[PDB]
């Protein structure tokens, strides 16, 4: 059975650590599934239109 | 106080030529001469 | 990682919300109206 005590923070103490670190953004999420209607390829005519 | 940095267009002073000409907001002057602190420091170190 | 920098604009200001009173148009009268 343990006693935790909170150690004083000194008031006149500047920040301690270099916060501004840049890295790329972490990998997103598990991609959703593309629940699309059947897609139609266009005629070459349409394509030229 | 001592007003420390005189305004010595250094392009002019070293190379006799300022690209700004008449409008150089500094002093066109090629005069080498012991400064306001050079002499103080050398003498006291002496 | 919460910084201690700060801003002139984030000083406390306009700290009470003006609630729409009885005469102006409270959601009650909107509950009623025809």
């Amino acid at each position: 059975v343990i006693r935790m005590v909170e150690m004083q923070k000194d008031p006149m103490e500047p920040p301690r650590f270099k916060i501004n670190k840049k890295i790329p953004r972490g990998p997103p999420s598990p991609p959703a599934p593309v629940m699309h209607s059947p897609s139609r390829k266009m005629t070459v005519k349409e394509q030229q239109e | 106080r001592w007003d420390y940095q005189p305004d010595i267009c250094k392009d002019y002073k070293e190379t006799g030529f300022c690209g700004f000409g008449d409008s150089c907001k500094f002093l066109h002057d090629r005069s080498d001469y012991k400064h306001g602190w050079q002499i103080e420091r050398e003498l006291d170190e002496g | 990682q919460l910084s201690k920098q700060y801003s002139s604009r984030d000083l406390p200001s306009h700290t009470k919300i003006k609630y729409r009173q009885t005469t102006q148009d409270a959601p009650e009268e909107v509950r009623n109206r025809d």
Partner: protein
């Protein structure tokens, strides 16, 4: 945090432990970022310790956030990993390591706080090699202070209050002297770990014979509290046995096997440690 993670040695002896907490106290030399710092009074006149790694930096490899050794066995992490045959891909370079730490904390946030993440469970077959290299009693020399450099030159004029053990300083020619904390955490060329490798390599294990048709195995040091069915139940479902000679005129045994690899399993696992009813048998391949 709720509290630290460290072994019993680092953890203490008195029933009532006293440790002070500072939130965002300093930087885990692993996660590189601010952590909480809990500082524990180790022992009477014994150096106060403090938490020295991020709790996630800890749950990563499952080691001691102060004592730095594993929490199950308590040998160098290089050792314990290899004793599980474990091969971690933790990245090293600055940007690579920061990206790794960030996604690591993201992935550990989805945990329940009970056990380390990942292969740390799918390598939980703690091999008798690790069990045997594991220390037995609390090597509580850890909480003795440094070499009071004053008291090494003479100078420690504070009386007995030399902040450090006023003994003879170790000759740093010893490989057991300068092990960079980051390297010890990365499992990077720990000379103490190589010493544990040499020790667990020279430590006695059962020997293999030459010809495959020597399938008779002599177990030396039997005694007359043993049965043939008990020698069997020692070496019976570990394969199939073909025969057994329990030499009572010499207090030994001999298992002729039906599977060579089964014989190997039983005997090599049994070397000097097959302790049924307390008798130190010796597993070898007979003549």
């Amino acid at each position: 945090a709720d509290f630290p993670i460290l072994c019993q040695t680092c953890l203490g002896e008195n029933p009532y432990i006293r440790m002070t907490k500072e939130k965002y106290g300093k930087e885990c030399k692993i996660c590189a970022r601010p952590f909480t710092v809990f500082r524990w009074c180790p022992g009477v006149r014994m150096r106060f310790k403090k938490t020295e790694v991020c709790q996630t930096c800890s749950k990563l490899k499952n080691v001691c956030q102060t004592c730095l050794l594993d929490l199950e066995y308590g040998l160098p992490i290089q050792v314990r990993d290899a004793g599980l045959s474990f091969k971690d891909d933790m990245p090293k370079s600055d940007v690579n390591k920061e990206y790794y730490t960030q996604n690591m904390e993201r992935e550990i946030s989805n945990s329940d706080g009970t056990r380390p993440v990942g292969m740390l469970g799918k390598a939980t077959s703690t091999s008798d090699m690790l069990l045997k290299l594991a220390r037995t009693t609390p090597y509580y020399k850890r909480n003795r202070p440094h070499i009071c450099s004053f008291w090494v030159k003479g100078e420690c004029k504070r009386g007995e209050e030399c902040p450090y053990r006023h003994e003879k300083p170790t000759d740093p020619d010893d490989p057991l002297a300068d092990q960079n904390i980051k390297d010890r955490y990365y499992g990077i060329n720990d000379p103490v770990a190589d010493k544990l490798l040499k020790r667990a390599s020279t430590m006695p294990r059962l020997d293999p014979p030459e010809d495959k048709t020597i399938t008779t195995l002599y177990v030396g040091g039997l005694g007359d509290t043993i049965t043939e069915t008990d020698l069997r139940n020692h070496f019976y479902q570990f394969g199939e046995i073909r025969t057994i000679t329990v030499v009572q005129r010499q207090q030994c045994a001999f298992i002729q096997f039906a599977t060579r690899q089964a014989a190997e399993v039983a005997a090599e696992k049994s070397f000097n440690k097959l302790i049924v009813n307390g008798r130190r048998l010796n597993v070898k391949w007979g003549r």
